[PDB]
Every structure is written in structure tokens, then in C-alpha cells.
Amino acid sequence: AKSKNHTNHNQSRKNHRNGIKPPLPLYMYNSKRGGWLPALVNTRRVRKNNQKAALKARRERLAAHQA
């Protein structure tokens, strides 16, 4: 008793029932884990300095307000 082997019938209609979802936006899931290491290490050092400057700025803004 043989039977069908393969078909793609009705598959396109099923996929469009809930539609082809759009791709994720460019600003999400944008890590660079597997990238070129020498540039990644340099960026980490700059990011650490930037965080230190951000903390100091809020300290100065608050102290100015308390006057």
C-alpha cells in the first residue's frame, strides 16, 4: 500500500495565517560577542571611563541644585 511522497500544498496559506513576522529591529540583540578581540578590549576600557564620568556629573548637578 503506497501513499503520497511529499507536497507543499497549503503550506503558504498556513504561514500567512499569522503572517510572516517582521525581523527584529537593529537596536536589539546587537551584542558583538564573536567579533575581533583587539577592538573589543579597547572599547571596554573606554566604556569604563565613560561610566565614571556619568557618576561624577550627577554628583555635581545635585550639589548645584542644593543651593
Binding site: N15, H16, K21, P23, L24, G34, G35, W36
Partner: peptide, 25 residues
Amino acid sequence: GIVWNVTPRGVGVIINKPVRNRTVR
């Protein structure tokens, strides 16, 4: 697509591809 990584002799590119009812990057 858009390049996301640069190496001495290579380039990494992000490309959309539809699979079933969604599209994968």
C-alpha cells in the same frame, strides 16, 4: 545586508532570511 564585524581579511554581514512563518537574522 549590514556589516557588523571587520577582520583582517573578512567581513561579517547580517542578512534576513524567511523560515516558516518568521524571518531570521
